[PDB]
Write an enzyme that holds these catalytic residues in place. Structure first.
Site, PDB file in Angstrom:
ATOM      1  N   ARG A   1      34.818  38.792  37.838  1.00 49.21           N
ATOM      2  CA  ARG A   1      33.371  38.590  37.784  1.00 49.21           C
ATOM      3  C   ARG A   1      32.791  37.303  38.290  1.00 49.21           C
ATOM      4  NH1 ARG A   1      34.926  42.637  35.272  1.00 49.21           N
ATOM      5  NH2 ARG A   1      36.298  41.142  34.230  1.00 49.21           N
TER       6      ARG A   1
ATOM      7  N   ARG B   1      36.483  26.738  38.534  1.00 52.05           N
ATOM      8  CA  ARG B   1      37.000  27.284  37.288  1.00 52.05           C
ATOM      9  C   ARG B   1      38.253  26.576  36.825  1.00 52.05           C
ATOM     10  NH1 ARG B   1      35.178  31.838  34.669  1.00 52.05           N
ATOM     11  NH2 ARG B   1      36.418  33.490  35.419  1.00 52.05           N
TER      12      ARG B   1
ATOM     13  N   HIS C   1      30.402  27.965  29.819  1.00 51.73           N
ATOM     14  CA  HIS C   1      30.303  28.896  30.926  1.00 51.73           C
ATOM     15  C   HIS C   1      28.818  28.989  31.265  1.00 51.73           C
ATOM     16  CE1 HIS C   1      31.670  32.174  33.416  1.00 51.73           C
ATOM     17  NE2 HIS C   1      31.807  33.086  32.514  1.00 51.73           N
TER      18      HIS C   1
END
Ligand SMILES: [Zn+2]
Ligand SMILES: [Zn+2]
Lengths: 146, 310, 146, 310, 310
Positions: free
Chosen positions: E54, E105, E134
């Site tokens: 995602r 990330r 996030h």
């Protein structure tokens, strides 16, 4: 009679959704003789009951002692030449061999070539069952989980 | 002819108050006067399918001090069960065509009982099966408790540790329930607790037990404090919250303890008994270890000799 | 002699040895209806047949056709208040979904949440089945496993 | 809109002689006259849960040569299907909400058909699902075979190698039993022979097929020699008996070959086609691989554009 | 220039109600009227040292849908941080000299804040730093919640699952304690319960929060049911007790749910949200995932363009 046979067995007061498991378990279709199954018939006190009619065939020990642990309600009827020669209810045994499977993952019963055996205390609560091998005792419900 | 002659020594449940006391009586005797060729010309199988220092080395040394011969393995890795894939049933079958008694350790519960169904005439003596029974432990513990307390009736025995997976504490709560007036105190992480089946039995015989969060809450009342190890190797993933020892005995906690009180531990011990306890007149787990030679000599003598005069 | 039925479905003329296999295969017993089953019955037409009456229950077009995989000589009697309102009969279906499992180990249908499905095909002795997904055809016999 | 716009391309068994012919005509056009912006503003997923050189890089180079963006993965190790444990069904469901077409390679047969249940209105093009189908392989083969032999009807086609796990030959034998009077010779081991289901489809259309144990037996008669690699990763350990190419071809053998004849191979080639064959006029596998560019851009164009390009 | 141009986006704790609102307004615009060339000539790093479906693919598809180039890595195995041993600090220092923005990330909390010390004038957008933040997850949640419930103030929001390692719920509980009269019910295990620090921030703004042991207890009252996955990789082996979703939801439970109510989940979903819920009107997780496209392009636009788009 609400179905009929000369010699044979008629089992009655079977709990609903138990008669078909019973047909499965005691291999009652490995048979060439007439069978009548009354699935999900009634029983005034306990609404619906299944009923099985094995014509000119009778059950052995093993099966009825199983039948106790699966159906303490049923009553098994020895019919010779239409007379109910005897109509007997089950009493539990001492010990059940070769059909129950021990809940203990690490029980040796699994890996090795041995017919199982279970000891049966009748707990005021329920039926405590003990493995011959690992010596762990279980609730009959833990064990009979189909 | 003697009562344990030829018996399989599997579960404490199978052994009675008198079989137990017969071993200990024997034990004290081979400890008093040794029997160096009692078992002269007997060959015995040491089958350890699971790690051991004490149970295998005590059992083996016992065999030698009675003149018996040992054959065996320390791991299945090398056997044809563990490499060529034969079953344990077949393994116990050929090994019983060779020796006079089989001693075995084994990771699955109930292996021991399975062995007997295939050993024919040969006695099978269980060195531990997974988390179930450890009857030779118990005998040496009973022996060690007797020596220190002079009695196996009316004690206050505290069991501390992993009571779920501990086979030692399983066997020991069953032999002591055979004696009169014994008070029990269980101190475990509740996820590593005493199996209700033992508890049921303790209740069925009207014996008194009790759970406690502390050890200081019972130190004052005990005769024996039996420490155990968390069985890492047996623990399930849900239980990894439970690997490090909860309750840990240190020399300072013994402060309000009965002078007679002994600290017993099957061993091995990891972090649960601080070594400062080893320098106290209460520490006794190493003495207890030594006493495994006499109870395993006793038990071999009794199963392999038809009459003992000593 | 089995039973009188007000309204429903009576699959009659099941080959003896298949009535139990059907009540298991298509979840027929998972009901609260009175089912009455005659296993091993004198037919003359077949030496022995089997027969199932499911009271207050009807089978669909496709439902009945699924039976031809196990029972093309069955006759499904649709009954409304004692009238044999219908005498339905299974052709081969073009697809049986959600009851079978692909013999192919590496098919997607095992690992993922999708119903199974097979294109049914009359080949040249038995019936061939083609998985929707891996697209391998299997003998229908094979499909009914070991 | 044209015959294949928004149409998923999963198996050769779902396309007609007519869709195939459209695709080759459009490749023929597109090779002659480029269409740089044809898919300007489109983004396509390139999802290989399996390994690839040819199919991944020819499909991502074709998309690029028509103005499109590529997003995706060459490996599943770092997706959340790879480490957080998701189903294919949800990978496909979220990836449908982002890109305009999905190209997917997968190790399980049926992955692509499974993906169409969830891709919504997005087309799923099958880059190969285990050992079932490889539909875009077939398209550059047809392109190359017609480009060389002038036709796609009345060809003597020999398929040599692993016909069991040959996803390439499953699709190609199905595509060529659509044109007429094509002739098949199947040269495999027994273990790894052509699927039964294929041959049925062949008997039903009365196609002439025949098994053979030698390239030498087919050499003179054949037009297209289609060579395969043993699907090493797809074999059963029982099948490891034949991991080396039973049939291996050298230039010597081309001695008795038909002047027109072309050696086609999907690639990789490991041991089966000797490097000396690389110098012959018959070797055509590096040519067939470049034809992956135009057949593959012919395709994308047809599925994402209504208007058939010119 | 606009409120967020060149601004790094690391934690929800550094943005106002106002920056959030800008981002959602701009997403609302951008969904209605595309901006193909908005970032034509920009190149962005997509650096995931962690796993993703995602966030990686929605951010690289959003960049692509505004005219930008993407360079980067999905895995660290082949970087020189991966095999030649470099620090993050130097990866970030050299990658700053090349691309105009960095999306990163990482498995360690604080990686992104660390990256801003070295990214120079380049913005660092946090795609998730271990179990801390996030921030762009929260933006497509706010977008989706307002898109569905009409508002972002005075919502009864239940957050079910792993609230300890839930980087998603850390940021979302912080974003929603910026709008008024929002109500929280936190349904976790104890082990994996909401962080203390979060609740403080909640007490200080007088927000009404409450713990609960059942979805059934909250069902009727709630508007947004926000479901999480147990952060399996982030657990302590002591915590492996609860790796399976204590709370698992089926369609049955939706029996007593408020007509407006929406089930939101960041995904992946493993066992916690049953596939039958997928057919309900309440299921909205595949919708919420597609809203990652517009919130994510709203963002890029605001940080790399001065002029607020229209
Ligand atoms: Zn057992
Ligand atoms: Zn399949």
């Amino acid at each position: 009679g609400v179905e009929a046979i000369k010699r044979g067995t008629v089992i009655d007061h079977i709990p609903a959704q138990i008669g078909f498991k019973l047909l499965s378990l005691f291999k009652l279709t490995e048979t060439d003789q007439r069978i009548t199954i009354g699935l999900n018939l009634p029983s005034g006190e306990m609404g619906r009951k299944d009923l099985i009619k094995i014509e000119n065939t009778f059950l052995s020990e093993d099966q009825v002692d199983q039948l106790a642990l699966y159906a303490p309600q049923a009553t098994v009827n020895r019919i010779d030449n239409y007379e109910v020669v005897g109509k007997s209810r089950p009493s539990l045994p001492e010990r059940i061999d070769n059909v129950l499977v021990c809940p203990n993952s690490n029980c040796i019963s699994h890996a090795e070539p041995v017919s199982s055996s279970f000891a049966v205390r009748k707990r005021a609560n329920d039926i405590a069952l003990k493995c011959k091998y690992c010596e762990k005792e279980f609730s009959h419900n833990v064990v009979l989980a189909n | 002819a003697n009562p344990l002659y030829q018996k399989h020594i599997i579960s404490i449940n199978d052994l009675s108050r008198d079989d137990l006391n017969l071993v200990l009586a024997t034990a004290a005797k081979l400890k008093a006067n040794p029997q160096p060729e009692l078992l002269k010309h007997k060959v015995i199988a040491s089958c350890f399918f699971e790690a051991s220092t004490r149970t295998r080395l005590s059992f083996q040394t016992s065999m030698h001090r009675l003149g018996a011969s040992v054959v065996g393995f320390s791991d299945s890795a090398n056997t044809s069960l563990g490499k060529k894939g034969e079953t344990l049933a077949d393994t116990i079958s050929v090994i019983s065509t060779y020796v006079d008694a089989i001693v075995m350790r084994h990771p699955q519960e109930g292996a021991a009982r399975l062995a007997t169904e295939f050993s024919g005439n040969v006695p099978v003596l269980n060195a531990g099966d997974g988390s179930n029974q450890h009857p030779t432990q118990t005998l040496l513990d009973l022996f060690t408790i007797q020596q220190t307390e002079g009695r196996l009736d009316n004690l206050h025995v505290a069991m501390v540790g992993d009571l779920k997976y501990g086979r030692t504490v399983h066997s020991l709560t069953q032999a002591l329930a055979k004696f009169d007036g014994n008070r029990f105190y269980f101190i475990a992480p509740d996820a590593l607790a005493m199996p209700e089946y033992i508890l049921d039995m303790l209740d069925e015989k009207g014996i008194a037990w009790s759970l406690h969060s502390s050890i200081e809450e019972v130190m004052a009342e005990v005769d024996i404090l039996y420490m155990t190890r968390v069985q890492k190797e047996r623990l399930d993933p849900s239980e990894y919250a439970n690997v490090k020892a909860q309750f840990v005995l240190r020399a300072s906690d013994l402060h309000n303890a009965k002078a007679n009180m002994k600290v017993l531990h099957p061993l091995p011990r990891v972090d649960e008994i601080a070594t400062d306890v080893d320098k106290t007149p209460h520490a006794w787990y190493f003495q207890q270890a030594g006493n495994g030679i006499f109870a395993r000599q006793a038990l071999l003598a009794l199963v392999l000799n038809r009459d003992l005069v000593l």
